[PDB]
Amino acid sequence: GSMAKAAAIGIDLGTTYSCVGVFQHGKVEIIANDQGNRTTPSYVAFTDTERLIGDAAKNQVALNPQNTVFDAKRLIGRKFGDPVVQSDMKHWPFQVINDGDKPKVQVSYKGETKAFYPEEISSMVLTKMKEIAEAYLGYPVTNAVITVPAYFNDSQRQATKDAGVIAGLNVLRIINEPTAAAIAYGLDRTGKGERNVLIFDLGGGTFDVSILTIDDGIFEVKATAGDTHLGGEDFDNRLVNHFVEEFKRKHKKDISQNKRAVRRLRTACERAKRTLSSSTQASLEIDSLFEGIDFYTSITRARFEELCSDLFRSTLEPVEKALRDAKLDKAQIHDLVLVGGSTRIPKVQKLLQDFFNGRDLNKSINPDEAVAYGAAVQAAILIKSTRAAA
Numbered sequence: 533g534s535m536a537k538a539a540a541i542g543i544d545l546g547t548t549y550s551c552v553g554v555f556q557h558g559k560v561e562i563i564a565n566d567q568g569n570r571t572t573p574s575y576v577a578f579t580d581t582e583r584l585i586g587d588a589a590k591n592q593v594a595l596n597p598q599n600t601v602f603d604a605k606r607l608i609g610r611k612f613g614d615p616v617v618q619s620d621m622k623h624w625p626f627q628v629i630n631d632g633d634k635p636k637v638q639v640s641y642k643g644e645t646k647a648f649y650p651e652e653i654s655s656m657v658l659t660k661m662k663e664i665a666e667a668y669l670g671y672p673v674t675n676a677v678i679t680v681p682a683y684f685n686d687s688q689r690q691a692t693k694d695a696g697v698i699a700g701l702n703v704l705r706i707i708n709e710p711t712a713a714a715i716a717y718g719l720d721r722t723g724k725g726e727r728n729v730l731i732f733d734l735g736g737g738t739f740d741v742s743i744l745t746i747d748d749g750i751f752e753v754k755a756t757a758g759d760t761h762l763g764g765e766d767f768d769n770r771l772v773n774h775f776v777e778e779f780k781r782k783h784k785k786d787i788s789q790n791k792r793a794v795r796r797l798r799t800a801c802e803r804a805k806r807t808l809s810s811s812t813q814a815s816l817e818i819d820s821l822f823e824g825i826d827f828y829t830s831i832t833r834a835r836f837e838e839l840c841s842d843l844f845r846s847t848l849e850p851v852e853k854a855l856r857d858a859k860l861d862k863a864q865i866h867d868l869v870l871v872g873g874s875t876r877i878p879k880v881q882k883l884l885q886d887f888f889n890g891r892d893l894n895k896s897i898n899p900d901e902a903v904a905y906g907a908a909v910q911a912a913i914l915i916k917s918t919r920a921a922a
């Protein structure tokens with residue numbers, strides 16, 4: 533009569549990391565990739581023999597900086613002359629060129645110089661997320677919901693759909709990232725009456741706050757605010773500067789000019805930063821860091837919290853601006869939702885909870901997975917084709 537339908541998937545197409553989920557048997561499964569990772573880097577690398585996507589691209593970035601592309605989401609649907617694009621290009625090791633006032637990334641690939649539109653790079657990341665899902669389900673996937681930031685305009689939304697089409701996906705809908713995080717908690721299923729929800733999204737490179745109103749499952753974006761220069765990478769930079777100074781004091785050597793030693797220090801700092809979210813102290817053990825000197829040290833959570841103290845406190849400024857813009861008071865917020873891996877930091881949680889006078893934070897769904905979780909919930913609703921009974 534009627535063949536069983538393939539499951540639809542939910543994709544969080546992130547600036548630095550992407551995540552895929554599927555809703556089946558009344559629950560969401562966040563799908564790990566073939567290296568066992570629940571999130572996949574939004575990186576594409578180009579060589580003379582291969583195109584690598586995800587963890588394989590990110591793991592070879594150190595020696596291939598010119599031909600490894602990341603941050604395509606900062607370029608998608610924008611003009612080459614846009615001041616945002618011009619500033620961002622100074623920080624990128626890959627070439628960004630001007631093709632009719634549209635940015636393109638130019639790399640060496642399979643013996644030739646090749647330029648790609650940002651949507652083409654994003655389609656390569658979406659192809660990887662589709663293959664991650666098909667490896668778990670064991671059949672081809674066609675339908676997907678893709679999320680975008682709430683501030684994305686029409687051009688940015690259309691370029692995201694185009695990336696989906698190039699990847700061979702049928703895009704069911706483009707949904708806002710804060711709306712997807714709210715859906716993950718079922719905040720649109722609480723029935724009649726208005727609810728005000730604040731989504732606190734602290735990423736690798738940016739911070740976004742959104743205030744939504746939910747009335748009978750209908751979402752309205754009331755206010756957005758943030759900081760483009762505040763994320764997990766700034767906390768990593770504070771630890772790097774701390775340990776460079778520490779090596780200087782202990783061994784009377786400045787390591788800051790050996791890229792490999794700085795990179796090995798930064799990699800270790802980011803992992804120590806993660807350990808400090810669960811432990812009160814973390815060890816740093818690097819062999820032959822500089823001039824055959826082993827660097828074995830530690831950092832307490834109290835010292836890390838002091839190093840980043842100004843940065844953590846500055847997350848409350850966009851919260852107050854969003855509340856003024858929404859014309860609401862903090863007591864009028866019904867639910868607080870955490871998004872992004874950097875929200876696992878205990879001090880960040882404490883500051884926000886203290887600001888909202890001890891209120892509980894929704895953090896039960898892994899913050900790096902909440903957006904994809906909500907996108908997978910929506911994807912399963914959008915493919916329903918039930919015919920009413922008499």
Ligand SMILES: Nc1ncnc2c1nc(Br)n2[C@@H]1O[C@H](CO)[C@@H](O)[C@H]1O
Pocket residue numbers: 548549735736737763764765802805806807809872873874875876877900
């Ligand atoms: N448990 C964690 N505690 C502290 N930080 C974390 C954690 N997990 C993740 Br993931 N991060 C950081 O989140 C950002 C995601 O782009 C990166 O800067 C990661 O370092």
Ligand SMILES: [Mg+2]
Pocket residue numbers: 546709733735871872903
């Ligand atoms: Mg995100």
